[PDB]
Amino acid sequence: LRKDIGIDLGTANTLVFLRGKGIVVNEPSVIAIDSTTGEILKVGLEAKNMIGKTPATIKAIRPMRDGVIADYTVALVMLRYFINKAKGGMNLFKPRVVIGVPIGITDVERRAILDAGLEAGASKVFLIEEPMAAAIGSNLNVEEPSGNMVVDIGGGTTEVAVISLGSIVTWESIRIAGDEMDEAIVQYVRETYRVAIGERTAERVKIEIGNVFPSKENDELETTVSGIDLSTGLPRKLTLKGGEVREALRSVVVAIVESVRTTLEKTPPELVSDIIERGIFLTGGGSLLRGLDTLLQKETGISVIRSEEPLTAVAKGAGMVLDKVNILKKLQGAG
Amino acid sequence: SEKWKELGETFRKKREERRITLLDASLFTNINPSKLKRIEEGDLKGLDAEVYIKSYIKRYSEFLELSPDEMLKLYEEGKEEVAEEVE
């Protein structure tokens, strides 16, 4: 009805794009329920917060387990939360909603999200694979017959898609992408110093000094983090150097590369020639690893482009799309 | 626009400062001498998608001794130079 919104449901942060406004929502994909009753207490940023104040009286539920929807009732609720913060409050119409889905998804998993959305408050809902949305959000012309290649690394899944004629022709999805990065940092810290760190700290180490390419510059990035010594139960404090960390991260990322390479191979040659000319479009919150662009290049030989807006591209696309009737009329519908 | 022209002018000038032909350039950055020509005469309007235009510029600049940033900066002044020129 009145306002149009695109949602990028992620396993990290959910982003909501409002048409006429922009990204009107960037809050963590989390609900906090009381550890006893199962009383949904807060959703979103309000929940990231009270989970750090009072973690001992709370169960944290993250509705998108892997790529799709696991706890449909919790989803429903999360969904209802974001469409509402996005809607405005002073708005009282059911909005039109285009949600980003992963590529490899069963119609059953598809039917679900359509329903959830419809219950959450949408007057009408569309789906769109995360990469087509990204391509549209950056203004690549997906209607054009020239090959395009997007690599969307999130936190849950890395997706590699060849777009050509408002369609996807080849793709690969794999379950390694950014949480597996954070995870490798935690493990490294555990096994080299005997120290235990956790999600939010892993994530900050990754941001401040994470990298997958050698260089005087990357090796002198340092940071200090705090954890618990697994031997003394006491709080320790380490200083990590970008250079100890690279070893671990490379192992994880090799598999994302392999996924890209594996894609190029089963791509129709005519499009490969366009992709070798234009480059690979590297997008997504998972992608912001120092040297990832450089490493991909070295390892596939095509140049790599970074999105100027790595975190908001899919959402902007999910909303951009409600004008594009020619690409709209092709999306699965409900409402 | 004028700033684009000066863009491609720097590219042309810097390429020729070496035994480098347009066609050699296109082999080292998988560009197309066609696209590079246009870039040099400053004609970018419909060369390709903006995202990709900004990547040729990066790539060319990296191939020559140029500063990628000082080159993209120009490209972007150039855009606001057609912008301001609208309304």
From TrEMBL, chain A:
It is found in: Cytoplasm. The keyword Cytoplasm applies. ATP binds at residues 11-13, 155-157, 203-206, 285-288. GO terms for cellular component: cytoplasm; cytoskeleton; plasma membrane. CDD domains: ASKHA_NBD_MreB-like. Its main location: cytoplasm. The keyword Transferase does not apply. Keywords: ATP-binding, Cell shape, Cytoplasm, Nucleotide-binding. Pfam families: MreB_Mbl (PF06723). It comes from the Bacteria. GO terms for biological process: cell morphogenesis; FtsZ-dependent cytokinesis; regulation of cell shape. GO terms for molecular function: ATP binding. Belongs to the FtsA/MreB family. Forms membrane-associated dynamic filaments that are essential for cell shape determination. Acts by regulating cell wall synthesis and cell elongation, and thus cell shape. A feedback loop between cell geometry and MreB localization may maintain elongated cell shape by targeting cell wall growth to regions of negative cell wall curvature. HAMAP family: MreB. Forms polymers. This is Cell shape-determining protein MreB.
Automatic annotation (TrEMBL), chain B:
It comes from the Bacteria. This is HTH cro/C1-type domain-containing protein. It comes from Thermotoga maritima (strain ATCC 43589 / DSM 3109 / JCM 10099 / NBRC 100826 / MSB8). The chain holds residues 2 to 88 of 191 of the full protein.
